[PDB]
Each structure stands twice: as structure tokens, then as C-alpha cells.
């Protein structure tokens, strides 16, 4: 009889920035993992962006399973990042630390974040994303507190009172929502529930995409 | 088949202000539990907060006990707003809105033509120039008007300009939800201090005194809106000179002494009563007979 | 069709003053059951009350006995007024005004041609310099006078001071009621309990010499126009000289002694009967011939 949080349920795929933590790579390939990445493929095709901390290329490889090819960016490829942030590069995925496929492209040292902080053109697009869009985060074992994320959004955008962003996490206690919620609402984001096992993350999120896209399209 | 009270039947659309009460928005639908009463409604706000995993087990059952009392459940909804909305007021939290959105949607899909005819009849008097105000949180009139006949705007008592134009009969865009309307939850004032702030201004109080003297008000479905707090504080306090020109109410006949008790009691408050004693599907048919009579005398 | 008793044509129109009965206001919609015979007025207020919730079915069955236990019927109407209008301090009470308008509404809808001839004739008789008095609450003779282009002044004795002008004959086209007036049912006084309290101004009763010997009455349609004692009380307390009372009544032929007796009583009182072959629409033409003969000899 389960339901999906309605304000996030109103959202239409162009509206969204999908930020992917390690927990989705952990949920993934298993047959339920291929059904998750099938859901990701539909979202990004319908005009969301996908971004990830993760160095893997599971998304680009799953695009080969269902008749597509998807392009990987790293934060040294500032030209393609500008075209991605301007919505022009459809089928382009960002890996924030970079992707294992490009060794010089990987950014980890503070100077890699500072290269984006120096790029006022891409930083203006980063502010613009956070002003315009609603963001959905997944599997936040690092992403919200990530030193790249903290440099890239958190130095750059101060509308932290005025956000309309959502997260998923699998709720085990009152304190787990609260404790998350306090730092999350200081960043500006709101918490949401699923709550039985990691198997709900594929199943819930596939029906969330179905309702988002069937309303939006 | 039934008569119209002739001093009411001969009134015109410019003269009137209508009130719709909670029973109507339920009665339109043969199959909506969640609006049948204030107890059905507060049951569904906890159903949303429970099923979305937004209220904890202890808090849910603690409020459920308080709601079992039947002791002013309308005021227990004030206590639920005090729990739900964070008072670090610069933070525009969504959660209260997300509760309400679960229940106050998928309404129209169930409905029947006799209910739609009631909404069209109400809209015809509003269009022809009546001002409408209502008890309810819902939007059924604004959805039904936006769909097939008018621009309809939903208003709460917080907005000084929009209430001033409503009092001046200018803002014929609007339907006035005295308490507050579910697609604007930040606006909701169940707690007295907000409508008491509308009492404070001397020129606004001239417009309010003028409003109660000038027109005839009709109430529908059940009229208990006379004593649902906000209505009493602004309108009823102003009886400095008890002119009380005719205002009118419908009721369903019951067993006869209940109707008698109401009739006597409200006629001393200032307000006249009329009966029907039939299947509720005839209540929309009766309201068509009254609607034609008023509107054809106006236009 | 047997013509004018030659007493009639002699009288110059400003000498006459008239009173209108039952069958006249019936003939201005004569298939409506509520006027066919005067018990029908209460039959219709009861048949309204069964649906319109003035009284229970058991109070209704008590009045059904009162319909079979007839005579006293005009003070049965006074007792029914005392049932339907005890009062608070002032205001506009729900049971009464807003129930009479089941029977004194929706007459004007049926002002047929044969009926309008009588009211037409009376109206020009008013313009020809008479004064007029009317039994009923009803306003037919006010409305079909504004149709021909004159807006009548209604009089009833609760408008206390205006008799100062009416006995001076100054308020031309003013019509003075008896069983009150439909535009202000508050004015009703069916009984010695009411009307004569105004006539405590005994200069009016003195000038009623000038209004009962120096001038001539004519009475339409009935016999009911005097045979319940109202047309003893408001007039015989001033004067009783049967030699020079100088007044008339229109009637119908029937079985011989049952026609004769009313002529015998009336002629002994000092009022003169006029009689023809019975049928309803002939009275309209009888009255117009009489009016043409009077108004031409008054020209």
C-alpha cells in the first residue's frame, strides 16, 4: 500500500539534478540493479542530468545493455562541463572526482576543486543550477559532506534558505531523520522515507521515475 | 417537491453573500470518507503523516488518543499545526503542505452529476455577482470554475489588499476561505491572533460594520459557521445597532424538535431557516429551483 | 339580462362609495380553488403548511376537524393569525409573511379578461371622484390600477392620521382596507379587538354621518359583504335611521324564498338588492352597463 512524498512526486524530469552516491553502485550487475539502471537511463534521456562521486562507469556500460551511449566528464574537462551545465550535452554524465577511465582527469587534491572555483563561467552555471532546479540525491555515505561538493556548491551558492531539494535514505530511527535533517536544512535539502531494506531503493525509485515522467511527459 | 421562502426567493445576486459548510463538499461525492466530517478529515491528516513515515509511532498513537476524545477535534487540528510547522519561520518547510496534498486530491474522479450541478449552481450565483465564502480547506469550487467558467482565486484573511477589495465587492475573482485553503498552507490561521489582527484597523472596521448591515447572507448544507470562531469574531462582534436585515440558512428536517430548537435559537441570533425533508439528491434539485429564481430576478 | 333598477342611473358618481366582496376577487382567476368559497382560503394555508413546516401532521389533523366544524371562520382566521404570529420585539417573523405568499402570490398571473372589466369600471369610478373601501388583504385592485397607469395609495386604519384627509376627501385614488393589506400584514385587525381602537378619534365617527347619510354605499358580488357582523360594527354605531340609509347590493337569482329573504332583510336595514339570472360572466357586463350609465350621467 506504500506511497511517494507528493512535492517530489510533482517534479518533471527536466527539473531534476540526480546526484548519485556509492549506495546506488552498491544497490547495482544484479537483475534488480539492471532494472535500477534502466530507470536511470529513462531519467537522463527524459532530460535530467546525472552526476556522481563514483569513479565507476556502470551507467555508460548499462547504456550498452539497452541501445545507448553516454559520455563521461571529469572536472579538468571544463569545456565539456560548461556545455553540460548549459543543458547542451544531453547524454553527458559527470563524475565529480573524475572517472577511473581518465587518470589525469581525476581531481582529489584541493587544487582540482580550485580549478573549478577559478572558472567563474562554470561557477555561474553551478549557481544557476542550484537556483533553477530541484536536486534529488541518492545513497549519501559521502556526497553531502564531500570535500569536492563542499567546495563546488557550498562556497559558491548562498541561497541555503531558499532550496527545494530532496534526498532518499532508508529510515531506521527518529534521530536518523532528525540528525540528517539538521545539517541538510542548513545546506537547504529535505529528507524523505523508504524503510524495510535496500531492495526498496530500486523498487520505490522505479515507480517514482514512472510517476515523475508520466506526469512530466 | 417543495416551496421557497418568498422573502428569500425574491432576493437578487447583487444583494447576497453565500456560505458553504463542510457537509456540502462531502455530499457532492458518494464515495469520499475523508471529508464527511471534521473527524474524517483529521483521521486522514494522520493517515498521510503515518504512511509517508513523517509521524512516529508514539506521536501518532498519542494524537490518536486525543482525537478519540471527540473534545474539540477542530482545536486538536490547531495542536497538529503547532506540531507540524517549524517556527524558525524563515525556513519555508514543505512538510505541512505534503501532508495536505495526500488527502485533498483524487476527489473529482469519484464524483456524480448531481454534485456537479450543485457546484455549477453555486458558480452561477457567484458569476452573476454574489460574493462566496466558505469554512473548508478544499478547492472544489475553484477547480470546477477554473475548468469550465471562471478565473477563480482562493483567498485567506491575511492579505489586507485582497480582503479590502473583497469587502468593497471589487475582487470578483475570489472565494474567501475564512480559516485557510489547503493549496496555501503558510496562510492558514486557525489560531485567533491573525483574524484578530484584521479586527485592529479602524477603517477596516467601518468596512466590516457596513458589510453586515448592507447585504443579505445565505448559508448552506449546515449553517454552524455562525459559531466556528473566526466568523463570530469579525462579523458577529459588530452588532452595535441590531438592525439585522434578513440572512437565511438551509437544514435537513431531522426529527422535528431538532429543527425547532435550531429555528428558535438562530432567529434570535438574527437568521431565518428553511427545510427540506427528502433524499439528498433532491437537495441539488431544490438548489436549482432557488438558483433560477434569484438569478432570473437579477439579470 | 334584466336591466337597471331605475334607482341606479339617478345617482351622480361622486355620491357613491363602494365595497368589493369574494366573487369579484375570485372572478379575477376563478378556476383557482383557494377562492371558490371562502373556507378555501384556510384549506390552501393548511395545504401549504403540510409541506412548508409551520405545523406537524397532528396539528394539521386538528385543523382538518376545524374545516369540518365550520362557521366562525373569519375568527378561525384570527385564531390562526394568533397561532402563526406571537412576536419578539419587532423584526419580520418567519411563519407568516413568508407563508401567505403561497396564496396571495400567483393570483396576478391569472387576471382574465372577464374579471378586468369590473376592476376597470371601479378604477374609472374612483377617478370620477368617489372614494373606495376593500374587504380583502389582496392587492388586485391596486395592481391592475397601476396597469391602467395609476399608482394607488393603500390605506388601512393603522396609518392613523390619514383619515383626517380621507374624511376631507382630499387623497384622491386612496383605497381603504378592512381585513388588513398584503403589503403590510402587520396591519391586520379581523375583530372588535382591533379596528375601533383607531375610531376613538370620534370626529371620524362624526364625519361618518357625511359618509353614511349624505352619500350612498354599493356592495358587490356576495351577501358575505355584510352577513358576518363587521358591516354592523364599523358603521351602525354612527347612525341607525332606516328611513334615509340610501345604499345598494348586487346579488344572484335562485330558489324564490332563498332569494327573497336577503332582499327583505336588506330593504328593512335600508340597503337595496338588485337581481339577475345567476351566471358568472354576466355580472361583469351588468357592472359595466351600470358604470357607463352612471359615468355618462356624471359627465
Author numbering:
A (entry chain D): 28 to 55, 138 to 326
B (entry chain C), C (entry chain B): 28 to 326
Provide passages from the article that reported this PDB entry:
We recombinantly produced and purified full-length FAM118B (referred to simply as FAM118B) and its slightly truncated variant lacking poorly conserved and likely flexible terminal regions (designated FAM118B24–334), both with a noncleavable His6 tag. This approach produced electron density maps of FAM118B filament fragments composed of five and two protomers, at 5.0-Å and 4.1-Å resolution, respectively (both obtained using a focused refinement in the last step), and of FAM118B24–334 filament fragments composed of six protomers at 7.8-Å resolution (without focused refinement) and two protomers at 4.8-Å resolution (with focused refinement). Despite the apparent helical symmetry of the filaments, an asymmetric reconstruction approach produced higher-resolution densities than helical reconstruction, similar to what was observed for another filamentous systems, likely because of structural heterogeneity within filaments. Experimental models were generated by fitting AF3-predicted FAM118B monomers into the electron density maps and refining them to a good fit. The part of each FAM118B protomer that is well resolved in the density maps is limited precisely to residues 28–325 for both FAM118B and FAM118B24–334, indicating that the flexibility of N and C extremities extends slightly beyond the parts truncated in the shorter construct. The final structures of all individual protomers of both FAM118B and FAM118B24–334 are similar to each other and align well with the AF3 model. To assemble into FAM118B filaments, a part of the small α-helical subdomain (the head surface) of one protomer binds to the opposite end of the large subdomain (the tail surface) on a neighboring protomer. The large head-to-tail interaction interface (>1,000 Å2) is predominantly polar in nature, featuring numerous potential hydrogen bonds and salt bridges, along with several hydrophobic residues.
Here we identify family with sequence similarity 118 member B (FAM118B) and FAM118A—two understudied vertebrate proteins—as vertebrate-specific sirtuins with similarities to bacterial antiphage sirtuins. We show that human FAM118B forms head-to-tail filaments both in vitro and in living human cells, a feature that appears to be conserved in both FAM118B and its paralog FAM118A across vertebrates. While human FAM118B and FAM118A have individually very weak NAD-processing activity in vitro, their interaction leads to markedly increased activity, suggesting a tightly regulated system. As expected, the FAM118B sirtuin domain comprises the large Rossmann-fold subdomain and a small α-helical subdomain but lacks a zinc-binding module.
